[PDB]
Design a protein around this ligand. Structure first.
Ligand code: K
Ligand code: K
Ligand code: K
Ligand code: K
Ligand code: K
Ligand code: MG
Ligand code: MG
Ligand code: MG
Ligand code: MG
Ligand code: MG
Ligand code: MG
Ligand code: MG
Ligand code: MG
Ligand code: MG
Ligand code: MG
Ligand code: MG
Ligand code: MG
Ligand code: MG
Ligand code: MG
Ligand code: MG
Ligand code: MG
Ligand code: MG
Ligand code: MG
Ligand code: MG
Ligand code: MG
Ligand code: MG
Ligand code: MG
Ligand code: MG
Ligand code: MG
Ligand code: MG
Ligand code: MG
Ligand code: MG
Ligand code: MG
Ligand code: MG
Ligand code: MG
Ligand code: MG
Ligand code: MG
Ligand code: MG
Ligand code: MG
Ligand code: MG
Ligand code: MG
Ligand code: MG
Ligand code: MG
Ligand code: MG
Ligand code: MG
Ligand code: MG
Ligand code: MG
Ligand code: MG
Ligand code: MG
Ligand code: MG
Ligand code: MG
Ligand code: MG
Ligand code: MG
Ligand code: MG
Ligand code: MG
Ligand code: MG
Ligand code: MG
Ligand code: MG
Ligand code: MG
Ligand code: ZN
Lengths: 206, 80, 24, 60
RNA sequence: UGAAACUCAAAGGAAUUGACGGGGGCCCGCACAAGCGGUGGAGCAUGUGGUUUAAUUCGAAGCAACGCGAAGAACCUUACCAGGCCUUGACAUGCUAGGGAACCCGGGUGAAAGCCUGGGGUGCCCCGCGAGGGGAGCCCUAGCACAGGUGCUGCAUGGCCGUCGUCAGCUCGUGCCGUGAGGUGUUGGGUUAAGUCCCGCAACGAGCGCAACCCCCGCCGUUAGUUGCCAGCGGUUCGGCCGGGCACUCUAACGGGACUGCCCGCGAAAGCGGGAGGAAGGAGGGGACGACGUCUGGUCAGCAUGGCCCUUACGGCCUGGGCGACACACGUGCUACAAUGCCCACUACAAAGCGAUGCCACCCGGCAACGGGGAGCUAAUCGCAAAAAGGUGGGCCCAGUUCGGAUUGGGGUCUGCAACCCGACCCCAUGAAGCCGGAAUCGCUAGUAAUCGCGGAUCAGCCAUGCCGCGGUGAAUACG
């Protein structure tokens, strides 16, 4: 029972909020609810595109919604009809009638959430967990990545007793503020239960 | 040292009921789930079964009982 | 002391006002 | 958070006093901050994800 | 000298890593000691055990459960109980099927929920002169696939948290030693808050930890004047009120500054002792931050989730009660037992915060709670607001009292559909125990303890004496 969330730890320096906007006390809770519904609809749709993040900005009755994805070809669709339907759902949920953008993620293996999602997928397909982890860490490390760590939680291999498998290399200095460590988390829903998957990636310092 | 306010509260469920009796008579008992209702002079002489949370208790009401709530005469807890 | 309803300090502690602790 | 209890949101609570807040996310009853509309747990989780604008860790 | 029946999956040797020792050495921490104030006694608040109950919902169990989940239990919350009801349901998606379909307003009954009943209105798509027929959504009845469960399992789990422990540690790569478990490194000497650094060394490096980069408080500067000031002059209803001005205070962004840098002494070095200059030295003060792992630690009752179980009820709606029971026992606290004090009057200095179905200046009524009226404020510009201890003046004169305000009678104000169970607040009367607390036991090393007030979160109101913050005054002691 320790180790605060590294993103939340770093939000001031070498990390920035996913939702950046100002609002009053009579406003905030509502816009927040909205953002939450947006992310909740987006993540249960665009999953197959591998979204690593969703940014949300506002000024007046307008919302950025910059979606970071590994495979923009999925969110575009054929000739751009997918993004049309998505903007349609967006306007149907929130009547604000706002915009949408798509940013490609170069080297999806350098973004933690995607790595975690990968390992999670492999676990859901009944891969060998230990090797899945070691492999993932290897792939992350081989491209940039001054450090990497991946953590899988209990019931590894469907075992009756929960366990924790480790597999990290490079440097992952969680206590350093200027670290700039991407963190990501993915579940695994299996027949025997649920597995947590954490992913730490350390790239650059100052 | 109790208080309520001006405009004393009585639930209108039985409020009209009791005077409906008084119009044509006395009759017998009553069944009331509202113990939050104050006692008013027109209720005197009647009999009100008050819910203690379990059963209805046959509370007979007298002149000196005016102003108290019905629930005061229907204790909810069973002790020793 | 701070437990006396009828004293200044009693009012201050209890955080209220009244006859024994005026609002001026 | 029982699902029937999410009947909390009512245009007709039948009384203003019967109206009580809940967590818009997890459905928690107790510990609901009015400002965020969330509960305290969700508050900390989302604050840690950085989904609450301006919300930072406080030290002094 | 020396058997047998019967019986066991071992008995045993040496060495390895640990843990332990009423074994040794070295060294830390309010651990003891030194000191200051407490708890244990009293009354009350609150949580728990137990008992009681129709129900007193569930959880938490030595530190690390017990003012804990609860940052607001009258209804709601609520998960418990009694009674009156509902079932393709309070919520999601879909299928078959008769009929009506969008929808609006009534009546009976009722504690409400619910059940029942009556009346308005027949837009869409297609075909037809029309009557009318068929049809999509939607809504009501009947059946089907399902919802739902705060029902059990935290040894089936995720996530998150507590804990040893902010403790000085835990490991890896390559090399070397050992048949091997393993060892070496990480041991030793010096030093440090630190596996911090130095020196040495079959080791050479490295990672997670330590430290640092982040925040607040300390001194100064730049940038900026709806806060500030006869610093400065003019006016003054003499109030920074008007003119006026960014010098000061402040406000909030950037930046400087401290590194054993300089001097003496010791030392092989790292560093130690002292001194100078400086607002500040040897980690300046306080936060955030808590390693490999341990406790089959806590939580399926915040959420998620495997398995199991109930599906005219283990689901669902409502009225009422209960979570507030009281012979008792414990924990945490509040107020006290007084003169270094209590009371009344006048008068002075703060920080951090909150404020639109909000804070509420000021006027009137009321002894008061409060009510009526009503200005300002999207708030460095108005309000909460009074800060209290403090100072000056006066009263009390050692007594269960002008100490202490429990208990109880009566009369009221406010919130709220509603204060019986079970709210807080005001006023009158009442005026309890308590004379510094047995064995035992707790916190704190400096602006700390002690003491005094102030704000906030949740919330209509409030059982807040709780929690989380803010400043005022400000100690004693540490041989060891
Ligand atoms: K040493
Ligand atoms: K420091
Ligand atoms: K466990
Ligand atoms: K004492
Ligand atoms: K005192
Ligand atoms: Mg496996
Ligand atoms: Mg009245
Ligand atoms: Mg007194
Ligand atoms: Mg649930
Ligand atoms: Mg409420
Ligand atoms: Mg609530
Ligand atoms: Mg042996
Ligand atoms: Mg002994
Ligand atoms: Mg001692
Ligand atoms: Mg006591
Ligand atoms: Mg209990
Ligand atoms: Mg349980
Ligand atoms: Mg405790
Ligand atoms: Mg506590
Ligand atoms: Mg109920
Ligand atoms: Mg089922
Ligand atoms: Mg456990
Ligand atoms: Mg767990
Ligand atoms: Mg348990
Ligand atoms: Mg257990
Ligand atoms: Mg330390
Ligand atoms: Mg600590
Ligand atoms: Mg080796
Ligand atoms: Mg050997
Ligand atoms: Mg060998
Ligand atoms: Mg080794
Ligand atoms: Mg070793
Ligand atoms: Mg050794
Ligand atoms: Mg080191
Ligand atoms: Mg050492
Ligand atoms: Mg060495
Ligand atoms: Mg300055
Ligand atoms: Mg201004
Ligand atoms: Mg200004
Ligand atoms: Mg200037
Ligand atoms: Mg650190
Ligand atoms: Mg309780
Ligand atoms: Mg008893
Ligand atoms: Mg008995
Ligand atoms: Mg106890
Ligand atoms: Mg004023
Ligand atoms: Mg007056
Ligand atoms: Mg001003
Ligand atoms: Mg005096
Ligand atoms: Mg005097
Ligand atoms: Mg007296
Ligand atoms: Mg006596
Ligand atoms: Mg005396
Ligand atoms: Mg005794
Ligand atoms: Mg003693
Ligand atoms: Mg200390
Ligand atoms: Mg409040
Ligand atoms: Mg009470
Ligand atoms: Mg308070
Ligand atoms: Zn929540």
């Amino acid at each position: 029972g320790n180790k605060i969330h590294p993103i939340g730890f770093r939000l001031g320096i070498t990390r920035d909020w996913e939702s950046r906007w100002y609002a009053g006390k009579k406003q905030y809770r509502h816009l927040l609810l909205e953002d939450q519904r947006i992310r909740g609809l987006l993540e249960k749709e665009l999953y197959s595109a591998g979204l690593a993040r969703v940014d949300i900005e506002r000024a007046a009755d307008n919302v950025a919604v910059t979606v970071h994805v590994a495979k923009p070809g999925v969110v575009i669709g054929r000739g751009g009809e997918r993004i049309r339907v998505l903007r349609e759902e967006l306007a149907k949920l929130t009547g604000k009638n706002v915009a949408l953008n798509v940013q490609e993620v170069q080297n999806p293996n350098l973004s933690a959430p995607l790595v975690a999602q990968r390992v999670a997928e492999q676990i859901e397909r009944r891969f060998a967990v230990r090797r899945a982890i070691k492999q993932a860490v290897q792939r992350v490390m081989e491209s940039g990545a001054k450090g990497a760590k991946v953590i899988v939680s209990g019931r590894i291999g469907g075992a009756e007793q929960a366990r924790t498998e480790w597999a990290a290399q490079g440097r992952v200095p969680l206590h350093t503020l200027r670290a700039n460590i991407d963190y990501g988390f993915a579940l695994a829903r299996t027949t025997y239960g649920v597995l947590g998957v954490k992913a730490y990636i350390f790239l650059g310092e100052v | 040292p109790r208080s309520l306010k001006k405009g004393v509260f009585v639930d209108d469920h039985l409020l009209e009921k009791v005077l409906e009796l008084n119009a044509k008579g006395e009759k017998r008992l009553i069944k009331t789930w509202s113990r939050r209702s104050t006692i008013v002079p027109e209720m005197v002489g009647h009999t009100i079964a008050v819910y203690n949370g379990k059963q209805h208790v046959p509370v007979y009401i007298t002149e000196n009982m005016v102003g108290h709530k019905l629930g005061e005469f229907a204790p909810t807890r069973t002790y020793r | 002391g701070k437990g006396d309803r009828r004293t200044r300090r009693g009012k201050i502690w209890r955080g209220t006002y009244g006859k024994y602790r005026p609002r001026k | 958070a029982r699902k029937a209890l999410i009947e909390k949101a009512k245009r007709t609570p039948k009384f203003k006093v019967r109206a009580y807040t809940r967590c818009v996310r997890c459905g928690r009853a107790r510990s609901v901050y009015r400002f965020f509309g969330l509960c305290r747990i969700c508050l900390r989780e989302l604050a840690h994800k950085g989904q609450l604008p301006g919300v930072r860790k406080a030290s002094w």
